[PDB]
Assembly symmetry: C3
Homo-oligomer: 282 residues x 3
């Protein structure tokens, strides 16, 4: 398989956005978890439904449609994705990552990715925020990769490196900012592992994932980071630990979508101010 989008498809979509808004963002943010309300803090906001933008993959999100919002957050011009695409919905990785390449063509230089994740690291608690220090790409091991197919030289190289995907300087800025917020809990940092989903893991699967060294497990983000790094975007991301995974055979209960939603709801306040504060440091 190969990318179903020609370079021209990306630029056509980009040219369309440019001619419909005066906003010219430098930062792009893909919202997840309780970051959904972040759009409410933008100034001079302009919203575009995914369905009205040519070439954009059609979709929505939990309880709300997918919208692309342009605006100024804490003095920084940015564009946000309110709702993303997941392979478990049927989308191939080249559709999932379509927005990342368009952002590049709009002049965006920094990408901020966020998600909800199940905690594998025993020291994590629900509500914890983990800076993504590194990732493990399981679908990648099998060849499921957004870069599979002929390489588009206009975006990047054939064999991009990933060992430096998560910007070091940004992670440092994140720690300083967290300190200034006076938070009692420590800002976590670790390895995110991605799998396909949509079902939740079994005890045995969680144990091996942890033994493989992963700290948090999720069903997104990685394809986006790959493509973003391929085209030279500075990347920074974090996971909202929405639940602790059942690692014990004596299952007291089980992971449920409801609980991850509640967590996203309860941490929204601090997630938003955290991202807002970081804008100034980018």
């Amino acid at each position: 398989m190969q990318n179903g989008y020609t370079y021209e498809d990306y630029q056509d979509t980009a040219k369309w956005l440019l001619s419909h808004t005066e906003q010219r963002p430098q930062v792009a943010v893909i919202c997840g978890s309780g970051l959904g309300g972040l759009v409410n803090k933008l100034t001079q906001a302009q919203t575009f439904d995914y369905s009205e933008i040519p070439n954009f993959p059609e979709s929505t999100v939990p309880g709300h449609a997918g919208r692309l919002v342009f605006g100024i957050l804490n003095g920084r011009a940015c564009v946000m994705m309110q709702g993303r695409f997941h392979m478990y919905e049927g989308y191939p990785f080249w559709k999932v990552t379509f927005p990342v390449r368009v952002f590049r063509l709009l002049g965006v230089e920094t990408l901020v990715v966020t998600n909800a994740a199940g905690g594998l690291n025993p020291n994590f608690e629900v509500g914890d925020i983990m800076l993504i220090r590194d990732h493990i790409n399981l679908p990648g091991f099998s060849g499921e990769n957004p870069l599979r197919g002929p390489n588009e030289e206009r975006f990047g190289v054939r064999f991009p490196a990933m060992s430096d995907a998560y910007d070091r300087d940004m992670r440092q800025k994140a720690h300083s900012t967290w300190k200034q917020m006076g938070e009692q809990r420590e800002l976590q940092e670790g390895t995110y592992v991605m799998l396909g989903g949509p079902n939740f893991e079994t005890v045995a699967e969680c144990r091996l994932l942890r033994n493989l060294g992963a700290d948090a497990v999720g069903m997104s983000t990685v394809p986006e980071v790959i493509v973003a790094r391929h085209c030279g975007l500075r990347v920074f991301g974090f996971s909202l630990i929405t639940n602790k995974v059942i690692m014990d055979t004596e299952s007291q209960g089980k992971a449920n979508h409801e609980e991850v939603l509640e967590a996203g709801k309860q941490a929204a306040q601090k997630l938003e101010q955290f991202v807002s504060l970081l804008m100034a440091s980018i």
Copy 2:
């Protein structure tokens, strides 16, 4: 990719079966290993070749065609799949699992899955029967999942839990029943790991599989359990350890399909009476 079957496809097939037999099963059994002869113990049996049932995936099995047999086993009304589908034959998971959803629509409430597996756990011996306590889904890690694509709300939820896939109470019943059979060998219990096949594993692959915590390795069953749990079927399954995997570089010999067949032949007698006895406890 998404499921190529609409909800209506499943119900059409179900309505067809209902109008062609007076049997109304509560239990569904997918036979593997030496359980192939189990059909011979059914009362008021009615057989349907897979090729005469609308929408059913076409196929067969080792030395025999695939047939759907309805009948009463030890006082319990059930339907059995004599031969299953495997991804290594070319079938996508949505074809492999087609029967599971039809069983649901027929009124079936319990699913019994059996298979042949290579023993990874050093304490296992050829002929051993292992109750599946948990599973590791390698194809799932890459996105190869029977639930990939839009979710059919009429079957279940978008994010189903799998940590409780193998019924606890049923596994307890299995141990009691095994005791009543006066078997000298202990009833094993463990983690089953699934991979695609059709080739047999290498020494290095077997060592990592064991390190990942798996007790037995096979090329089926997991997709069926996923779909079954998604639609609310109580699941119980076991593996017939047909051979011990070569974990030593000094390969004395090598896994062969012939030997797994012999094992299936020699254990048939006890596999059948075991499943027969369990019917009363469901």
Copy 3:
């Protein structure tokens, strides 16, 4: 999915080659790394561009097109693939492995595979040559396998064993030959792990790969060995360690395609004489 080539497709291509050259090779070699110049040591060489051979997958290689070269190397009649196909370019495994089955139909009995790999084993140094003793097939775990689909009985069996894929006797011959070359460095030997690519691994991915027991990591070769063993070809292969993988978070630098190329350039001299010497021992 299934193989898109019928048995007849393979034999048509084979018959075409036979009627266009008087060469009748017993050995087939798939060149990688610095082995690209090996064609320059052939006698009575005859070259065929991949694009002029019916049914052959279209492609090329780094800095040069793909060519099939027939010739005599150190007294042995062989055919060489100057450039191979990779799944990361978009090719399904049944296209990648097409040449292996044609070689079989030409009368070839031995296959020599070579590649460039990143060193995971701490004792390896750039320039090291590692005899492939065993492999780990990650894409295989998910079902991505060149044998997926209906089995062609005219090539081999439905469930081929892989625990003896790398010929024992050949590896012994390789050690003796290396000794006769007076090389100061020891001939390495180990497990090769394959992943899809095209991006290079992250620190976390490299650590788990090493923990899984792999010594070298690459993006090819395994599909070819599978198919070759399926049709009864004696297989022998080795990896040129082109770089040491970044296993440390304090990334001093990062894997780059340039460096792997330099390594391939600097070791070419000994790679060629090594393969040349081995011809006599086959």
